[PDB]
Amino acid sequence: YSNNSIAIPTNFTISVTTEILPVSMTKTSVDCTMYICGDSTECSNLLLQYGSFCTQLNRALTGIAVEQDKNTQEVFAQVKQIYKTPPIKDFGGFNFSQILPDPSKPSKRSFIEDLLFNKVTLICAQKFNGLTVLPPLLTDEMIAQYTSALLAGTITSGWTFGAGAALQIPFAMQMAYRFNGIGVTQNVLYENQKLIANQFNSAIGKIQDSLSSTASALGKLQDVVNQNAQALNTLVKQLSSNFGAISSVLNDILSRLDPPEAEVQIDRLITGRLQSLQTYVTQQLIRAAEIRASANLAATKMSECVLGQSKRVDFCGKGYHLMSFPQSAPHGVVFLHVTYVPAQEKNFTTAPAICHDGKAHFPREGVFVSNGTHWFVTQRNFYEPQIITTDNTFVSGNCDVVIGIVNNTVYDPLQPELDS
Amino acid sequence: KFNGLTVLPPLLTDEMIAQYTSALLAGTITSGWTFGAGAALQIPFAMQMAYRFNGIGVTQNVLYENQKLIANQFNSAIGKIQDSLSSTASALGKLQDV
Amino acid sequence: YSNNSIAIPTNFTISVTTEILPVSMTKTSVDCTMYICGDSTECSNLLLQYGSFCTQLNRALTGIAVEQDKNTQEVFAQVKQIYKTPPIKDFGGFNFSQ
Amino acid sequence: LQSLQTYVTQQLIRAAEIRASANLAATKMSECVLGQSKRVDFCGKGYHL
Amino acid sequence: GTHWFVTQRNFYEPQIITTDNTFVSGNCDVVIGIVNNTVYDPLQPELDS
Amino acid sequence: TESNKKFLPFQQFGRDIADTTDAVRDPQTLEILDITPCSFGGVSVITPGTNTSNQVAVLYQDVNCTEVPWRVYSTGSNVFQTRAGCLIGAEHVNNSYECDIPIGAGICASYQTQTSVASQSIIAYTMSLGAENSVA
């Protein structure tokens, strides 16, 4: 760091960054009296005379379920109408066959999300013990079609469909708008269209590869699924204990004991199993609130990154951000952020201002850099030399208040046009 | 500790934590805001603050109009912050709550 | 207010303020059977007569611990490379030694 | 067991709360530090630098 | 079909292409899909004086 | 039912995680019977606002509709099977719309008031994700 040292980057790279979000868990349900007891007539009376605990648990579990459903609905809800991919792909050279869905499968899945479908992903025993599993309303197919419409709108209309009606506009101008959004002026994109096309398609291929070679990046969804399944298997194995009572099977002990002593022994056994079921449903509520937090996070991304461009940083991946293509996953959603990142850095000597005619001069948009001989104005995020014209400057004050200024000439764009 | 419930050690020691914060602070000061995005860039702190001024809505020239002045307030600001802590304990109230 | 009367600021200020936030509650771990049973012979068997609690509680607490770890390592370790501050500190008036 | 259990549940709840606060701190650090967040009264009182 | 017009990305407002709200960079081959037309210049009348 | 699990000599009952009794040996003739408790899907009522009607449809969870028999009557051949389960009291329409009542597995139900055929009907169908619309 020095009072005249600046390092403007000159060569950039688009880079693909994946991001993983556990949008929901497996919708779960536990029939209160059914798990505690296999519908024995004595358990009926005892659990009835116990309290309204099991109805409490049914209400809480159904709340979890319907809230997971609300999550899956709202996280993709930002689609007034299901847009559809235009047949041909003249995307200025941006191969989208991997991200977009194509009729290869009878389903409208995409080539990338197939790796997810296959890599992230004993219930017969649970199915007979009351411990059931409901299915999700938004099925894999409709989730995939929502992702398809989202990507289609994101490609063909930029952000107008997020705000209002979808508006045709080619991908070139869309990238131009986004670059303007991150400072770099359109000139760089339209001067490096083919180069950026190669970079983008190569990066898409490399992320496809990096996912195809190992299934370790798709971490957190696997951890969520394992947490859920381990909770369920703990809830089942819990049945095997004795809690001081005779045996882990009701129908067994109903044989050994007359109604009187069966009453007390089953009082103990039910207190046990019911405390356990309470523990299970409480941990389930807590993980459900955590998943809803991460799902509102996913929604904020899907409505901020995808349908627009987050000026703010590190909310759509590392680096200056451009856009993000969402993709479905079994009980999850993954984003392919395509982030701008400057790569090659050249040193320059900088001037905080300029004294041309005794008055100060300030860069209206860029920065005053130089290599010693000529001073230039440049865009703060991409090396672009420019001669010092009054178009890039606004005079202000004089040559005293400024600190660190340098003397120079500021060319006037009229002199030859004044000679005639 | 004699009844099982020990306190596991926190992973990152105070040393490495303070070092991480020093890294963040250095990157903010010198490298501008780029170091969290790409590679760090030497770039003058005065011009960096000028870019931030242009961020909020005031044109950068204003900074160079009053550079010294700014620092004064800035520095005096730091001053009160210091005494803002040693004066009253409950100024720091969240961490103590937790 | 009136339909043709604007206000404009002329002099401004900087007011450095603090914003404290928690990061990691003290990562605790409670032994499943050392707390409940005073390391005896019949009581421990009577405990394991109950369900898989010894694993349940301890597992949830280990989850709390690893979440504390990830918190501390995510709210801070966003820096790419630990930076060193420059040898000299010339900021045109920004004394930073605090 | 009942006592330790209510302790563990309350501790996990407070842990989720701290996790929310930590993600909030992550956002602040990655916007109030690694950049400049224009959002008023997210960083602090007044425009943020 | 007749006159090019520059217009913001939200509200249709026609604007004959004054060189004031337009800027040049480079040549006419690196770009893609460019079209041929004379960008209007405001400095002709008062230079004719 | 008849199982294929090869049976060790004198051990009697086969278990699973659940501490229940999964398999047994008939003591009379040494045959290895499998024990599979017949499915019990929770009943779920499908209704419009009772302020509107009093005819409703019943959704059972995933069960073989054969197992379905307090039911008043079973709609004749109109029992529509979903990926979620059997549903009695709804004609399988193909005219897709936006759906109010969630049924699951893409299936949604809604009340329909016709002029001639079932002026008070409760239909279930494949939900349309919306009015498909591709721009040029």
UniProtKB/Swiss-Prot annotation, chain C:
Highest taxon, organism lineage: Viruses
- Impact noted for substituting D90H: In strain: B.1.1.318
The chain's disulfide connectivity reads C32-C54, C37-C43
Q: Give the positions annotated as glycosylation sites.
A: N3, N11, N95
Functional description taken from the UniProt entry: Precursor of the fusion protein processed in the biosynthesis of the S protein and the formation of virus particle. Mediates fusion of the virion and cellular membranes by functioning as a class I viral fusion protein. Contains two viral fusion peptides that are unmasked after cleavage. The S2/S2' cleavage occurs during virus entry at the cell membrane by host TMPRSS2 or during endocytosis by host CSTL.
What name does this protein carry? Spike protein S2
Species of provenance: Severe acute respiratory syndrome coronavirus 2
What does the organism's lineage look like at the top?
A: Viruses, Riboviria, Orthornavirae, Pisuviricota, Pisoniviricetes
